[PDB]
Design a protein. Structure first.
Length: 539
């Protein structure tokens, strides 16, 4: 039924089986491993549960403000065990403070190394001392801050959808020696569902580390995935880029990547050229290319919406770019126009492309907003009726045959269907509209990112009633001419490959463009930093 009861059943079936292994790289750059069997993580969970029942009642929120590691896991699991709504946050910002005010927690779970409601340092609890839950709301997944309410029903449904789609070629049964491997942060939906929940729900073990460790030496990702068994992992697109760029072959001495079962690529636009570099670079170590699975979803859907066909490598389709910017997907020849990853229309949940101004499905090939319906779709945002209604209350006008009327999750993403596959253009609010045509930041950035090889951000800045293109461009500092080579180069490439004039090319130092913990650009941030003149230009 719930995560706590599934955790207890893991304990009955395999008390001494390994459950969680955390590889810490902070003191020893080669890694220090610490591991918990099912019994051991259950004991700690129960001790955390008892400490938390002293400060808070069933139904209260419990904020988790710990660094990545084993204590985070038993803080979250212990909150669920005691019937609290867990609120996974990062370790200290201002967001953290606004989430606490929104969630009004009756307890905080933290660690001594970082410090009204009672704060608990779970590492200073006697967690291994020897020796209830809700059936509905498990935790709030925070993005003004809005916390997605995730129920056990949401979780169970997405896992049925995920296990069915990911393991369709083996009859929805994962292999006996599957293990999970993740460096994604536990306070993001991908990292929480994969790293903390999935080991319990699937009945497999997890090998875990921090996003900070991965960004230091991206080879550690490949190394830990190559451990004994068939690895299941996930990462954003540019983490594929980074690993392809920074890993050294001697770090990969005698690594066998041919047992890796799945690496999801999701949480941002999946670029075929990144995927091609990753497979070209690492096919030498037997990385099977059917192991790579583009995956689309969002926190409002718990995590999963759609993925590539199991047992095949990613499928790429090509469309006319000018037609795309005009709102129409016109297929073209392999290598022409713009390339997009094919996503098979999922069986569960279901996807529709919908005109956001008329609440009516688009004809195939017409670009509109991606709408989602299914039991994995959350019931709303915590204590936000109005915003819940705006985001979760999609109602279809004159639904097509078999298509439910509602309620539909409005994803905020632009996309289209072609040949019973759908494609994702990008986030609507990040699109650059010039002369009635929509252009995608992800495509412009690829254009720049090939000449720069540094990071990018293509943003729209309103001025006197139109949108102007501005490009924040990271670049390596270690003369005045090359700088004007790059300016000339990037400006022309955008013009020749997009028909756009760049109003402003902001050449900055590496690390000036804001990025996620997983490393993804923040485009709405980039905008008002530009608008409040907060960027320093290499001139
Ligand atoms: N496979 C994918 N392809 C394209 N876009 C994706 C994919 N997976 C996730 N996304 C995008 O990430 C969004 C949800 O990520 P979420 O964590 O819920 O908020 P976010 O961090 O603001 N992501 P984003 O702004 O898109 O980079 C989805 O709406 C998509 O915009
Ligand atoms: C076998 C267990 C599978 C566990 C998978 C959990 C992670 C699933 C990720 C699916 C796509 C994620 C994209 C949505 C996240 C986001 O963008 O906010």
């Amino acid at each position: 039924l719930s995560i706590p009861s599934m955790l207890r059943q893991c304990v009955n079936l395999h008390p001494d089986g390994t459950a969680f292994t955390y590889i810490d790289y902070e003191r020893d750059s080669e890694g220090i491993s610490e591991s918990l069997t099912w019994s051991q993580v259950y004991r700690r969970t129960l001790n955390v549960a008892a400490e938390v029942r002293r400060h808070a009642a069933i139904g209260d929120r419990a904020v988790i403000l710990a660094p990545q590691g084993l204590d985070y896991i038993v803080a979250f699991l212990g909150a669920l065990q005691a019937g609290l709504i867990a609120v996974p946050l990062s370790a200290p910002d201002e967001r953290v403070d606004a989430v606490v005010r929104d969630a009004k927690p009756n307890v905080v779970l933290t660690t001594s190394a970082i410090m009204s409601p009672p704060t608990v340092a779970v590492d200073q609890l006697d967690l291994d001392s020897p020796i209830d839950s809700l059936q509905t709301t498990a935790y709030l997944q925070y993005t003004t801050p809005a916390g997605v309410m995730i129920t056990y029903k949401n979780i169970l449904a997405n896992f049925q959808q995920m296990i069915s789609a990911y393991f369709a070629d083996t009859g929805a049964v994962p292999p006996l020696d599957l293990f999970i491997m993740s460096w994604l942060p536990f306070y993001h939906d991908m990292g929480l569902v994969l790293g903390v929940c999935a080991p319990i729900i699937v009945g497999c073990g997890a090998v875990l580390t921090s996003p900070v460790a991965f960004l230091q030496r991206p080879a550690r990702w490949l190394q830990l995935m190559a451990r004994e068994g068939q690895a299941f992992s996930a990462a954003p697109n540019f983490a594929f880029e980074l690993t392809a760029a920074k890993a050294i072959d001697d770090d990969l001495a005698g690594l066998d990547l041919g047992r890796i079962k799945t690496i999801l690529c999701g949480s941002e636009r999946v670029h075929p050229a990144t995927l091609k570099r990753f497979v070209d670079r690492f096919s030498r170590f037997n990385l099977r290319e059917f192991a790579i699975r583009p995956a689309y979803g969002l926190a409002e859907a718990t995590v999963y919406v759609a993925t590539s066909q199991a047992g095949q490598p990613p499928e790429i389709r090509y469309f006319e770019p000018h037609e795309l910017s005009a709102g129409q997907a016109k297929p073209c020849a392999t290598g022409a126009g713009t390339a997009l990853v094919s996503y098979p229309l999922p069986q569960s949940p279901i996807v529709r492309i919908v005109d956001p101004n008329t609440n009516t499905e688009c004809p195939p090939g017409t670009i509109g907003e991606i709408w989602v319906h299914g039991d994995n779709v959350a019931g709303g945002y915590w204590e936000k009726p109005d915003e819940t209604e705006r985001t979760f209350g999609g109602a279809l006008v004159a639904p097509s045959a078999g298509t439910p009327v509602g309620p539909w999750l409005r994803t905020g993403d632009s996309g289209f269907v072609s040949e019973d596959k759908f494609f994702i253009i990008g986030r609507i609010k990040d699109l650059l509209i010039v002369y009635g045509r929509n252009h995608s930041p992800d495509d412009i950035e690829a254009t720049i990112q090939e000449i720069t090889r540094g990071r990018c951000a293509a943003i729209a800045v309103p001025s006197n009633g139109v949108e102007k293109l501005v490009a924040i461009v990271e670049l390596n500092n270690r003369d005045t001419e090359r700088l004007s080579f790059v300016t000339r180069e990037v400006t022309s490439a955008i013009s020749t490959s997009h028909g756009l004039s760049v109003s402003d090319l902001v050449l900055v130092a590496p690390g000036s463009i804001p990025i996620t913990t997983s490393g993804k650009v923040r485009r709405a941030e980039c905008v008002k930093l530009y608008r409040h003149n907060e960027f320093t230009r290499l001139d």
